[PDB]
Design a protein around this ligand. Structure first.
Ligand SMILES: CO[C@H]1C[C@@H]2CC[C@@H](C)[C@@](O)(O2)C(=O)C(=O)N2CCCC[C@H]2C(=O)O[C@H]([C@H](C)C[C@@H]2CC[C@@H](O)[C@H](OC)C2)CC(=O)[C@H](C)/C=C(\C)[C@@H](O)[C@@H](OC)C(=O)[C@H](C)C[C@H](C)/C=C/C=C/C=C/1C
Ligand SMILES: CO[C@H]1C[C@@H]2CC[C@@H](C)[C@@](O)(O2)C(=O)C(=O)N2CCCC[C@H]2C(=O)O[C@H]([C@H](C)C[C@@H]2CC[C@@H](O)[C@H](OC)C2)CC(=O)[C@H](C)/C=C(\C)[C@@H](O)[C@@H](OC)C(=O)[C@H](C)C[C@H](C)/C=C/C=C/C=C/1C
Lengths: 116, 117
């Protein structure tokens, strides 16, 4: 299904993982596969398909706010689409070469593991 | 004259001379730069903001890798430098994902666009 937030964040469950999938909660280290796109033109700026999974501690601001919120509650094998407003990404200013000012971002994220 | 080395292995080379009285990147000032970043061992460019909005940071507070805090210091607007940055002054043993492996030397070309205060 779909959840929207008043700030414009959209979190869509694309597919469910197996029933026994470990759950991602704040403070857990998680491993994910992702494809990241600029929402304005569908240009893919990064993916780790065919690469080592991306590991981070959920809920500590290591990653953009849209990920901390959007990955929370995933179970192993779940895939979500996150449609992230600038305020939950890199803001008005944008970021480096990769992210223009005022960028809406779309990520497809698959939860690979959770360290309980 | 136009190359300086540091005991940690950093090399700072002046590529281009900007404005003679151009505002100077001094510690504690917010500075705006254009850059190209390359993995030295295979010459793979991992990022650049050339032709895009400049990158702003506060110099000398550890918000960026050590090689930048040291290497950008003293630039004047319009200057360009090449930084040859050892792992200890970059991403060290951990690296930065697959694009920047453990124990990687980095090279950056950096151009100073502006200094605020
Ligand atoms: C080469 O590839 C990059 C990732 C690239 C950069 C460019 C962007 C387009 C992108 O392609 O990822 C991208 O797809 C993206 O936007 N990502 C990556 C996947 C998670 C979501 C998002 C993100 O938040 O990235 C992150 C985004 C760019 C920066 C953060 C945004 C939120 C903000 O609160 C944070 O403040 C801290 C900074 C990058 C990361 O996920 C990496 C892992 C983490 C950090 C750098 C910070 O958390 C830092 O905080 C001190 C740390 O704790 C780290 C471990 C310290 C060590 C030395 C540095 C490691 C650096 C690794 C860098 C990696 C693999
Ligand atoms: C999307 O693009 C990324 C930049 C990418 C990430 C991946 C690397 C390959 C790279 O492509 O840049 C790259 O070319 C690179 O290596 N850079 C960027 C240009 C400066 C030199 C170097 C660097 O130090 O990056 C930095 C490197 C990855 C991490 C730092 C390395 C030194 C270490 O001491 C720091 O510990 C603290 C962490 C990223 C940055 O320059 C950004 C600005 C700074 C931070 C995230 C931290 O300082 C953080 O700590 C709380 C902050 O104080 C910030 C301001 C808080 C706000 C909310 C977050 C802003 C996030 C911006 C993210 C940006 C533009």
């Amino acid at each position: 299904q779909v959840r929207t937030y008043p700030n414009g964040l959209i979190v869509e469950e694309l597919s469910m993982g197996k029933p026994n999938g470990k759950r991602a909660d704040p403070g857990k280290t998680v491993s994910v596969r992702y494809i990241g796109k600029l929402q304005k033109n569908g240009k893919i700026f990064d993916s780790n398909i065919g690469k080592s999974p991306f590991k981070f501690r959920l809920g500590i601001g290591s990653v953009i706010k849209g990920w901390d919120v959007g990955v929370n509650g995933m179970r192993v094998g779940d895939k979500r689409k996150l449609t992230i407003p600038p305020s939950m990404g890199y803001g008005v200013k944008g970021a480096g070469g990769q992210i223009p000012p005022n960028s809406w971002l779309t990520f497809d994220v698959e939860l690979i593991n959770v360290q309980l």
